[PDB]
Design a protein around this ligand. Sequence first.
Ligand code: K
Ligand code: K
Ligand code: K
Ligand code: K
Ligand code: K
Ligand code: K
Ligand code: K
Ligand code: MG
Ligand code: MG
Ligand code: MG
Ligand code: MG
Ligand code: MG
Ligand code: MG
Ligand code: MG
Ligand code: MG
Ligand code: MG
Ligand code: MG
Ligand code: MG
Ligand code: MG
Ligand code: MG
Ligand code: MG
Ligand code: MG
Ligand code: MG
Ligand code: MG
Ligand code: MG
Ligand code: MG
Ligand code: MG
Ligand code: MG
Ligand code: MG
Ligand code: MG
Ligand code: MG
Ligand code: MG
Ligand code: MG
Ligand code: MG
Ligand code: MG
Ligand code: MG
Ligand code: MG
Ligand code: MG
Ligand code: MG
Lengths: 419, 200, 64, 166
Amino acid sequence: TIFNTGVPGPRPEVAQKLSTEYQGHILRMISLAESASELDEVLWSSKKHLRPVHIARSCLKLEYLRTKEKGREVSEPIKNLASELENYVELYSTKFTIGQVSQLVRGLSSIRRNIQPDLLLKLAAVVVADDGRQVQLANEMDCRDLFFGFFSQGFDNELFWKRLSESVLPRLPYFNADVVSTVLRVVSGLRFLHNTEFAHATMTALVPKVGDLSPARLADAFFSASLLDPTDVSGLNAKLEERFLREFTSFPIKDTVTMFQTVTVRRHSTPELAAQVAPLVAAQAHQLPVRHLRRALEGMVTAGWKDTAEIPLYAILAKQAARLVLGKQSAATSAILGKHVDNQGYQRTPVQLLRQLARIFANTGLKAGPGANQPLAPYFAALQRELEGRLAELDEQVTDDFAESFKKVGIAEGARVQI
Amino acid sequence: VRTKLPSKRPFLQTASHLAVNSLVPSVRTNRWADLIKGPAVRSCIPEIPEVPKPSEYTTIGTIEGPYTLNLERVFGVVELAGSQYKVTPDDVIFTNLLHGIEVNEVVMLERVMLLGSRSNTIIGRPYIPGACVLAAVEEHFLDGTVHVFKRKKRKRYRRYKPTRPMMTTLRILKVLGIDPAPGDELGIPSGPVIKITNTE
Amino acid sequence: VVFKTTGGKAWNPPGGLKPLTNTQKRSRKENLQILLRNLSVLKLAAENQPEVTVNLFSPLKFMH
Amino acid sequence: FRRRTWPAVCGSLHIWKKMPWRIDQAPPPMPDSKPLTRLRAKRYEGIKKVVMPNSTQLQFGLYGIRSMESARLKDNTLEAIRRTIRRKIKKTGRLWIMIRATVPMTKKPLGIRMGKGKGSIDHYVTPIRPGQILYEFDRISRPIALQALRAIQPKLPCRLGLVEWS
RNA sequence: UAAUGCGAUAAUACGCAUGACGGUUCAUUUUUGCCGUGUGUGGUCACGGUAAAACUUAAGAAUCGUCCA
RNA sequence: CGUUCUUCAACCAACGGAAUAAAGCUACGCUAGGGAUAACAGGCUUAUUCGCUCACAGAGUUUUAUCGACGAGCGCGGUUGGCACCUCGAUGUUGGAUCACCGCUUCCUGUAGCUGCAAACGGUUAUAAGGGUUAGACUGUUCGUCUGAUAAUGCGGUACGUGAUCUGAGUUCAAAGCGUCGUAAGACAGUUUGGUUUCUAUCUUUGUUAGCAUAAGUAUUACGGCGUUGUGUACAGUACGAAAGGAUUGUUGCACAAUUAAC
RNA sequence: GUUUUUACUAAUUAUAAAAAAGAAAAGCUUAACUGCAAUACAAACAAUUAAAGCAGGGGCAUUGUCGGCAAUAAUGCAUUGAAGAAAUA
RNA sequence: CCAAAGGCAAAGCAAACGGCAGCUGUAACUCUAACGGCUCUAAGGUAGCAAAAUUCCAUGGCAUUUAAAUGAUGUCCCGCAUGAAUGGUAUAACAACUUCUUAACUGUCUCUAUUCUGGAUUAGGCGAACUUUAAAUGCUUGUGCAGAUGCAGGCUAGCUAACAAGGGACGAAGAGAC
RNA sequence: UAAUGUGCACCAAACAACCAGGAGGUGGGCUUGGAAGCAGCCAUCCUUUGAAGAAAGCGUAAUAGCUCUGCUUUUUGUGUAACAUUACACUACACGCAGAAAAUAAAAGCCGAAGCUCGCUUGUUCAGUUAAAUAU
RNA sequence: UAAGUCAGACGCAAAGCUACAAGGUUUCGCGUCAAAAGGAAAAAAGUCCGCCAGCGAGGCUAAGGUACAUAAA
RNA sequence: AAUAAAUAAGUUUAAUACCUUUUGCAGCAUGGACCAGCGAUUAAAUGCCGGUAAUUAGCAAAGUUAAACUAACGAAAAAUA
Ligand SMILES: [K+]
Ligand SMILES: [K+]
Ligand SMILES: [K+]
Ligand SMILES: [K+]
Ligand SMILES: [K+]
Ligand SMILES: [K+]
Ligand SMILES: [K+]
Ligand SMILES: [Mg+2]
Ligand SMILES: [Mg+2]
Ligand SMILES: [Mg+2]
Ligand SMILES: [Mg+2]
Ligand SMILES: [Mg+2]
Ligand SMILES: [Mg+2]
Ligand SMILES: [Mg+2]
Ligand SMILES: [Mg+2]
Ligand SMILES: [Mg+2]
Ligand SMILES: [Mg+2]
Ligand SMILES: [Mg+2]
Ligand SMILES: [Mg+2]
Ligand SMILES: [Mg+2]
Ligand SMILES: [Mg+2]
Ligand SMILES: [Mg+2]
Ligand SMILES: [Mg+2]
Ligand SMILES: [Mg+2]
Ligand SMILES: [Mg+2]
Ligand SMILES: [Mg+2]
Ligand SMILES: [Mg+2]
Ligand SMILES: [Mg+2]
Ligand SMILES: [Mg+2]
Ligand SMILES: [Mg+2]
Ligand SMILES: [Mg+2]
Ligand SMILES: [Mg+2]
Ligand SMILES: [Mg+2]
Ligand SMILES: [Mg+2]
Ligand SMILES: [Mg+2]
Ligand SMILES: [Mg+2]
Ligand SMILES: [Mg+2]
Ligand SMILES: [Mg+2]
Ligand SMILES: [Mg+2]
């Protein structure tokens, strides 16, 4: 009756693979994965039961995982996992559907990975095969991903874009505003579509319904419309400007900065608009990446706003730019925590962006060197420290460009900034 | 204990431990085995690589019209559909159902294990690189009915399940890799006219 | 095995259980060598155990 | 391995532990002169196969006879052996008898079907354990002891051996 | 545990008095046998138990005897 | 008149106790079921029975010639038992008539030793299964007792051989008597007188014969069947032996009996 | 049932129960109660077994125990009948 | 012999239904007990007959009958468990009753043979019945729901029937009566 | 019983066999009609010493005699109810027999299932989070 | 599942009863059969190996085998 | 148990019907000669447990039948004033 004595011990730990009975749980498992390593193990265990639907969904999941690591370089495990998913796509290159191809391209484009030119042609052939019969079955979300996904990959095949545009043309009037905005972004980015019938049709389709555009899409539409149609043949730019004036206070900081710069390019800026922008930008200057800081400086400078005692916006922007370049935010947090050995990831800005910012500050008209405490002093001080560690990247032309900026601001003695 | 009623002792003990844990907090708050538990891995040893094999069969074209075949003086051994065949031109073989091919198409077989003539023999270990066999697809058919019957005497058990297997038929056209012995060359046209439709 | 030599049921031929042949003896020798070899391996594993146990992946544990 | 539960390891009521007779290794005591009992026994009480301790020796004499196997001997067999030994050795010989038949055995008469209770006593037996010493001799020579051993060997179902004190 | 223990008036103020010899009662798991479970052509197998039974040499403790070598 | 609480009692001892109570016969019997279950035969078991070996104590008194034991082991499946495995939509009882096949643990007819073997008549062991193994009085018998002869009148297996071949005296249906038991119906497991025994052979086995299938005659050899028996007498009152008594031996001679073959 | 004393430590159908325990001796007593009860042992069910604790009235002590007896056997459902008391009609 | 338990009747009735003992001592040597003692009951079986149509030991002992007698007749006798109108003992005649013996006769038998009439058997005509899961259906040992034409080993080689016998097909007939 | 092996014991002669004596006190004492070595008891001592027991056995009414424990040459592994292993025997397939053959493999290897495996066939088990244009 | 089942059998290992018999009987531990085809031992319910969705002239093994019957030294 | 799987067509290998009833049946246990036709959990009322719907049901026609429901502890405070 009794053949073993004692309390039952722990069960043995056994390595197992996915069984055929649970083939329908693969999509759920992909969603539940919380890291690249976990997703790698999920795919490995299910290797014998992988299908094109699973391969496409995994690449889309890379975008979700990478989002949690914003502000840092793409992690090594993500890159290694992407190197394996690419091989699977090659095997199933001709078995994907139009909806699945859109997911695959978006995921790989978000990770900033360049797909091989031969794979793009094979993937492109799938979309436009059979006279675009399957394009009539792709929904709005599929179309949006196809346009932006292929554009972000640098695809420059004239025939592919010609056929794709023809199939989508009759459906534009029924797409949502956000989808139409993405189409305009692609059209403006492709030179050979600048003055086609498809380009005009897109503008005419967007004008009737503009109240549904989101802040981010609204800013892009205004940018693209201004570039494509300098003269208001269609009542689009005028309508977009009216919306900007009415709801200027409601939009987020990033979109307001971008839209303001577009108005200055359009030469419709007024002193009243410049005055109203300053209090909002000064308060939320810390919520603008380096790219948006450059837009803010150019827009305000073009508008003609001058530094005021109450709101010295230029001084605030210079400090904010220095923090982003130096990446002091991570160090500041570690100081409060008490552990200064904390790893700090960063995305170094390109030298080209540094030159553009330096020229804009020089054109601002403020000094940095002469005075002990000048508004632009911290930015140039940070620039010198950064360039000291990037001398290898420095070139003769780059040195001359910086030297001109240094001379304009008032530092030409070959000495480090006071601060 | 003599009673056959299932015992409720485990239920009574669980109710007591749950009540104590609910009301009385524990003193310890960590477990070292949990703290240093490492990431899950697939295995503790390197994976074993697979051995490559030549392609089984691939289409190369179609047949345009009626043709004739003559006898040659070479033969070979080819692996196909899980079994091996000894073939010479103008032979007919029967295999399991092959997917992805159509009647009046020409296929290429590359898993060649042995080539022979009347003056030389070539042995593959286990396959001969640079040899192939050509064949024409002639039929996709259902074979004769096989009647499957089971019964158990005196147990009221009886089952009947007829079935029809699926198979494919091929005709061998050419064997490439070994030259005929001197004086055994076929000096006249032998095969059909093939429209090549597979360029890689 | 059957050792009983009585009764009408002929489990064994007349004369009882027959002695093992040379092949049967060799068969039983190899069965015991396998058993002894397994015990020798478990001794090696115990003398070379690492400090930290390895964690192995299982899809079913992952799901739950 | 021991077949008990965890509560039994801690609160067993079997306080006074006695080893069962079937497997107890203690040597049997010297035979006494008590009268034979009239109480029926169980068949296991007449059989015991465990070997004798590894320290057994002669206790009184210089020569003796031991059993190399277990067996169950009846009262009739012992009487025949006793007469044979007495006649073979001498009148002027010292003999110790270390065994006695004391376990009753039952039997039923012919023509009786199974059941209706246990039978009545028919005879007595004694168990013999391997290596046990059965008889001891003194005031004799070694050749005489060998003659006694050969005389009784055909009359017993178990193999016998000679023991000497040294 | 000498604020001990024992006593024949036995009460405890008095009697014997903690050493030394002799005889009794209580470590390489002492290591062999034996027993239990699993497996088994009935033993060229494995592990455990004996503070249940037989079996070794000590060292110490508790009385007891004693003009003491 | 009804309800609740506090309590008890009777038969339930076949003691989970209820249809209030409450014994028998059937051989004049009937129906529904079981080889789940008995009687005959088979099977398993071998206590018992029987046989052999060891044991050589004890009688005989030199001999283990012959008789023979305590005790132990092994074998047989024929004695008395145990079990309930096959058959209850059926496996005909005891003995005999008729006709058989087999084993050897040998009664006679053989062969070779020992002997408390002079001869004759015996005793015992080993080996040998071809032939033979009688006619009657009593009894339903098997068995048993007895009578006149005989070389001798062996044992066992075969569904304790044999009823689709015969017999029916016993046993075992319906009638009746006596004795004993029961108040009685009745019972005996005691005894006595009487009391129905069916079947045209389809398959297999066996004895004969014809037709059909490779012309007829003579046919060595091979293969198969059968089984070469028994008593008396003469060779001799010789060998042997005090006497009495009384032989051995034979491809023997003669007469007779059984069996077989014909006439 | 409960208190006190000590030259005692037994016996049962059977039995290695028990020393802050029992037996005997001396004194007072009726808890061999009324109304309830957490949680367990066992067990097909019916029933059967142990029991902390709460309220009332008591006994011996003077703040402890008593809901019969060292423990393990001395028994019988429902129905029907009968008695004491109480509530209706 | 009418006690007990019943029935009937005039408080009595047995040719109404029924019953009818045991222990122990004793005569010349022995044996036996004519003759004593005790207990109990309603009464304690009298005459007659008796190895029976009644007897367990049993085929009792003796005589006759035969060469040979579990037989028959006679006889001895407390007879497991005989017995007097559920009658006891005898009895001339009578009996398709049961038992034993004598004379004669015979195929009942030693021991069978021949033959007549009818059937069988051969030919023409006429024309049933029991039975049938399917069959192209050998022996022997082994095996097994424990006795095999059909399973395993060792054997078996012209073909289909007729006339004849009755070992097996746990042969056929009737849902075993014991 | 047989066969093999181990343990133990013994070319200073083990084992089998031929060649000579087995004496005297002594025929010990006793019993006895006889006893010396053998009807039966006590005793089992002494000497010669080349051996010898107050003769082991067969017998003689006692005798005598043979040969036996022990003796010199001569030629000459043995013994062992001690142990272990293997294989046999102690008497009926009572219809009729387990094939043929057989004085050498637990070997590198191989055969062997509806088990495992390879090829083919049938049934069963929705989400969309990214914006990376340097335009005046 | 308010279903069916309440006739069990044998092998190895123990104990009671029988005669330390029975293919006997009563309990108990494991396994197989019942309700289980396939392979090995002669036929082979209960022993040894091993659990059949279907087809195929592919391959490796288990128990057991490797001069003939009969695949392999 | 008269078939199966194969074959060079000569042959070779595998192979003891079915039902019922049983611990176990090729069974020497039960039933059937063969063919055609007929031959056995059906209907009503009520109750219980699942599934699918209506969103109370039936009459009547501004009013009546049937069913169902009907007090348990009024327990929260989340104000960067
Ligand atoms: K009852
Ligand atoms: K019957
Ligand atoms: K003879
Ligand atoms: K009358
Ligand atoms: K008459
Ligand atoms: K017949
Ligand atoms: K028919
Ligand atoms: Mg049998
Ligand atoms: Mg093997
Ligand atoms: Mg009842
Ligand atoms: Mg009947
Ligand atoms: Mg039966
Ligand atoms: Mg039974
Ligand atoms: Mg003989
Ligand atoms: Mg006979
Ligand atoms: Mg008979
Ligand atoms: Mg007959
Ligand atoms: Mg009658
Ligand atoms: Mg009468
Ligand atoms: Mg009467
Ligand atoms: Mg008549
Ligand atoms: Mg209950
Ligand atoms: Mg109180
Ligand atoms: Mg109490
Ligand atoms: Mg009368
Ligand atoms: Mg009359
Ligand atoms: Mg006629
Ligand atoms: Mg047979
Ligand atoms: Mg046969
Ligand atoms: Mg019947
Ligand atoms: Mg399988
Ligand atoms: Mg029942
Ligand atoms: Mg039962
Ligand atoms: Mg049984
Ligand atoms: Mg069944
Ligand atoms: Mg292999
Ligand atoms: Mg071969
Ligand atoms: Mg049966
Ligand atoms: Mg029938």
